[PDB]
Amino acid sequence: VRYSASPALETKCAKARGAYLRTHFKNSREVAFTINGMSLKKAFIFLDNVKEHKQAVPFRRFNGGVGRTAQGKEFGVTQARWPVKSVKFFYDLLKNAEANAEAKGLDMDKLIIKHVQVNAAPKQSSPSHIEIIVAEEEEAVPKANDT
Amino acid sequence: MKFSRDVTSSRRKQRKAHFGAPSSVRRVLMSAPLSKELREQYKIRSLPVRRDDQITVIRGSNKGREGKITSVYRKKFLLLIERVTREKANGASAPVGIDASKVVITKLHLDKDRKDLIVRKGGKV
């Protein structure tokens, strides 16, 4: 499948995707743009707190009538909530995000979430497409001395 | 040009009577040219295609592969020759449809019917 991201090279990256996911579109997005750019294993510890109401995810764009919480100020956002159905779907994807590097044979403890995408779907609600990119953090070699 | 008011020149009428012809018309539309060695001993430009003929393929990607016809598939307008088989992913082999107009007949499966067609249609045995 032809993906939307310049990253996800064969070298140190792997991808999964999920299509025609019968959730809302304005609810998985704010989850998606929160988990974006983070490390992989931290995102797992992150989102399970959403599943036990230990951390709420901010609602930046589609902030319709979202009541203020005490923990939304960890990122500076006024409004946040605890969606449980959408983050259940992301856990299914991120298992495939692991289990694809587990078959490509990468290094798992330098693995960041590089590009998460959330799109619409052919209406039957407001279904969704999701594709995810997990990649190693592209480390840097120290320079040789002088010349 | 054609000078008969009882033949049709419209693409509509001709391209319908082809693709929806019955399986007796679909036989003489699948004919093959004879080889240059048979064209002079039977004096026949072309024969309708039987099963178990002895052909060679002139055109297509399967150029020059000789064989015998296994199943003359009158529905989809193509012969099916021996051991000219495109592979399949699963591990089995698939038959490649060679058009009946591309093959050249090298040895007929002569029978009483064909001979009684050969001896009258311009030639002999």
Binding site: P7, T11, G105, L106, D107, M108, E138, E139, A140, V141, P142, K143, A144, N145, D146, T147 | -
Partner: protein
């Protein structure tokens, strides 16, 4: 079926059975393998996934690693000997360009010269031809001679000759990237880089690959830990220059796996023509011409 609505309902229900019994084939297989992991083995030793490298056309010129004398009798006495024998001639490169080249052809002509020390840059001026260049460049202690050949402000081809009579190779550059464009790039240094060359099974593979060994210095400085790669894969000659640093990586069995950081450039070649003798595009004898119709088979390789 001439209908469209029927045709994608008859197929939806047909797929949902083909998507059901495949699970029914694997569910009954799921219970006996954890009772008996020995049947797990055979299948794994039976149904290895088949890939293009494993389903090649059988070409008989795949030279095995067993040293046969007629090979080493040839290539120890060829014109690449000076860069392989005890003399160890440091090759002095000459990188010219196509006539009336542009700015976007010249910033790439500094990135290759970053890769190649013992390599000058001499922009082609006015009326001079490649066959007259080679004889005029061998008399001043030069070894090989590259020609970057742009068109319409993009570089598309690259020819290198071998002096004064050696084989001349006409690749075409593709998928061109500079050093600025790559994410997480690095600075190059004056250290002479190191070489790796992979997957040149064909005999012609060990004719080009020696003409790629012929551009690099025959013993490099290791302080820079810089590595240059020429990776043939499906007849594309990938060129990637990297800088490495060894660090522990538990996944690969030795535990020590380096981490690469690319420097640039990032180009990728085909192989079009090979001429023994200096490259004359019309007055030459062809060692190997690329057939653009016999490369349709993705399972046929010539490199």
């Amino acid at each position: 079926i001439k209908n469209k609505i029927v045709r994608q309902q008859q197929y939806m229900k047909a797929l949902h059975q083909k998507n059901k019994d495949k699970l029914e084939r694997r569910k009954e297989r799921a219970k006996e393998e954890e009772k008996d992991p020995e049947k797990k083995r055979l299948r794994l030793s039976e149904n290895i996934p088949a890939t293009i490298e494993s389903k090649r056309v059988y070409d008989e010129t795949i030279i095995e690693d067993k040293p046969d004398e007629e090979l080493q009798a040839e290539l120890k006495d060829d014109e690449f000997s000076a860069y392989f024998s005890e003399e160890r001639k440091v090759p002095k490169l000459l990188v010219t360009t196509s006539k009336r080249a542009s700015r976007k052809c010249y910033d790439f002509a500094s990135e290759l010269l970053d890769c190649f020390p013992n390599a000058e840059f001499r922009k082609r001026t006015g009326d001079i031809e490649v066959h007259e260049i080679a004889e005029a460049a061998a008399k001043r202690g030069y070894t090989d001679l590259l020609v970057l050949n742009e068109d319409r402000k993009k570089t598309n081809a690259l020819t290198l000759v071998h002096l004064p009579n050696g084989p001349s190779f006409y690749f075409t550059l593709s998928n061109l990237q500079t050093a600025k464009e790559i994410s997480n790039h690095g600075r190059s240094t004056g250290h002479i880089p190191e070489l790796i060359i992979n997957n040149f099974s064909t005999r012609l593979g060990m004719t080009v690959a020696r003409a790629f060994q012929s551009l690099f210095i025959q013993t490099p400085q290791i302080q820079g830990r810089q590595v240059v790669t020429i990776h043939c894969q499906r007849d594309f000659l990938f060129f990637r220059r990297h800088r490495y640093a060894f660090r522990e990586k538990s996944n690969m069995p030795d535990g020590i796996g380096t981490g690469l950081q690319e420097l640039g450039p990032r180009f990728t070649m085909r192989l079009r023509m090979v001429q023994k003798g200096v490259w004359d595009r019309k007055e030459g004898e062809v060692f190997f011409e690329s057939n653009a119709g016999e490369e349709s088979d993705r399972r046929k390789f010539w490199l």
